[PDB]
Structure formats: structure tokens, C-alpha cells
Design a protein around this ligand. Structure first.
Ligand SMILES: O=C(O)C(=O)C[C@]1(C(=O)O)C=C[C@@H](O)C=C1
Ligand SMILES: O=C(O)C(=O)C[C@]1(C(=O)O)C=C[C@@H](O)C=C1
Lengths: 117, 117, 117
């Protein structure tokens, strides 16, 4: 029963809890919309932030998604790359799905559109 | 038979190898006990520490679990959050299981009990 | 069909784009050869770097692997451990496979050979 990673990326303008939660929620909702993801099918999720964001764990946003309270999530620091995109939040959402690898819809929002291949 | 993540978190009082390994092992053992986990059913494990812990990789504790020598494990730095729990170690253990998402037993020990939902 | 993590580690001599990409590419190619891995069977990959590496994301090397353009990858920062191996890049490649846990071929190259059990 196949499992696949779904990637998301977005950015915030400021390091505040309000903006980190708002943008993270918007990113998750878009991933959910595009991939028709049900929470019970999510194995786990990893969220990362660049080391310029500190106000809150982006995973707190998952609680604002009804039905997602049992989805296991953890946060990590993104690698600090010289010249890399700043104030960036990324998601690796691992899901049970039969959608082929090439049709998985990865989501890039805000200033992270530049990360689109 | 699906793949699911199991979360664990704990804390240490000191940044010493002895305590990091002791608390990590205790956390792993509690997870294994509550979820009846066999090492062959573990896809992989991720361990994280806040950036105030430097004495040893928590993954070294896995060596102390009989039969877990082939479980793939890697470590990462936890996101540094203002006012966040200090000296915190987390686990994301990915397993094959029949247990429904809402019945998976996530484990929070020591000062990380405040993380429980 | 079970899922399994496949670990890789390697090192670079200096923090440059050329070295990071070359050594990461070499590590990935060796994992792929040893485990006969096809990109469609890869759930996702996580790459990490110790905090002395900033030149480029090692994930950029995945784009040099023909056919791997749809494999989801994200990078994270490795813990800073005292006496820990410096300038180190690690891979956790999650794949669907029947191969028993004890027969999975994990790969350690360059100065990271000291990590292998
Ligand atoms: O579950 C934990 O260990 C938490 O500290 C909570 C939480 C979350 O808000 O969901 C935040 C940060 C951790 O990296 C993972 C999850
Ligand atoms: O095999 C490696 O990559 C190691 O360096 C060893 C080890 C471990 O203690 O098991 C320690 C740190 C790494 O993040 C992952 C695993």
C-alpha cells in the first residue's frame, strides 16, 4: 500500500506567531485542496523553518485544521544556506495515496514560488 | 496494515552524554511498550534535539535496545522557538501497524508532559 | 508492500557548491546501485548537513539524477555534537521494498566510513 511525500513551501513577512500560523495554515489547506488529502491517510508530517523564524512552531497551525488532531507532526530547523530564501516554512507531508509520483501536487506559495521547478 | 508515525518527547536537566542517553532510552522503551513495537516493523526513526544539547547524538541510545541494530535512524536540530521547552529531545518513529491513527500511543515524559494534547 | 529507510552518509573537504553537489551525487548513486532503487518506488528523501556547511542545499544534487525529478526531498540541519564528524551530509531515503531490514544496503563514504557499525 503505497506511501508518497507531498512537499509545500511558503514564506512569511515577519517573525510573529500570527503570521507564521496564518501562512502555515494557508499552505496546508492548499496542499489538502490540491491532493484531496484526508487526515487519517497521513502517516506523519515534518515542518521546517529557516533559522530566522522563532515566534512559534508552525505545527501549532495543524490544530486549526478540524479532524487533524491525531496526525503526528514534528518541526526541524532548515539548513542555513548562503543566499537561500529567507523566512521560509516548508512541509513534507507523508501520505497513503495511489496517485502516481508525477501527479502529486506539490505546493509553492508566496515568495517560495521561486522554488518551483 | 498501514504506515503510521509515533511521537515521543522528553527532557534532560543537563547536557551530558549520560543523561541524554538515559532519557532517550527511557523514552524509546516507553514507546515500544505502549505500542508493542517490533524493530522489524520500524520503517525508520528521526530523533531531534533543541540547539542547547551537544554532548551526544540521541540516536546512540538505540544501540542499547536489543535487536534494533538494523533500524535506520538519523538526527536533526529542532527549530529554536522563543519561550519553547529547553533541552528537549523528540522522536518520530515510523512503523507498520494495524492500529488506527487515533489509537496510536504517543509518549511524553519529564518536562515534555506539557506538550500532551 | 513494506516501506524501509535507507541511510547514507558522506563528507566534503570544504564548504563549496562543487564539493557538496559532487559528493552528494556520488552518495546517492551508490545507494541506488547497491539497492537497485527505482525513483517511482521512493516515498521521499531527507538530507541533512552539519552546521559548518552553507554553500548550497545538497538536494540540488538530486536534479542531476535522470528520472528523479519527481522524488520529493527536503533538507534539514544536523545537530552540532561535540567531537561529532565535521562537514557531514546524511541521507534518509524512504523506499517501498520487500528486502528484509537486515539486508538493506546502507552506504557510508569518504570520512563518514567511521559512522558505519
Ligand atoms: O509534540 C511535540 O513534541 C511538540 O512540542 C508540539 C509540536 C506541535 O505544535 O505540534 C511543536 C514542535 C515539535 O517539533 C512537534 C510538534
Ligand atoms: O550513521 C550516521 O549517520 C551517524 O552519524 C550515526 C548516528 C547514530 O548515532 O546512529 C548519529 C547521528 C546521525 O544523525 C544519524 C545516526
Amino acid at each position: 500500500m503505497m506511501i508518497r511525500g507531498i512537499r509545500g513551501a511558503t514564506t512569511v513577512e515577519r517573525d510573529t506567531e500570527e503570521e507564521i500560523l496564518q501562512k502555515t495554515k494557508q499552505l496546508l489547506e492548499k496542499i489538502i485542496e490540491e491532493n484531496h488529502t484526508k487526515p487519517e491517510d497521513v502517516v506523519q508530517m515534518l515542518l521546517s523553518a529557516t533559522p530566522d523564524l522563532h515566534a512559534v512552531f508552525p505545527a501549532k497551525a495543524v490544530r486549526e485544521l478540524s479532524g487533524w488532531q491525531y496526525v503526528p507532526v514534528t518541526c526541524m530547523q532548515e539548513m542555513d544556506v548562503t543566499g537561500g530564501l529567507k523566512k521560509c516554512i516548508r512541509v513534507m507531508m507523508t501520505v497513503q495515496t495511489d496517485v502516481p509520483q508525477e501527479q502529486i501536487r506539490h505546493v509553492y506559495l508566496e515568495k517560495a514560488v521561486v522554488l518551483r521547478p
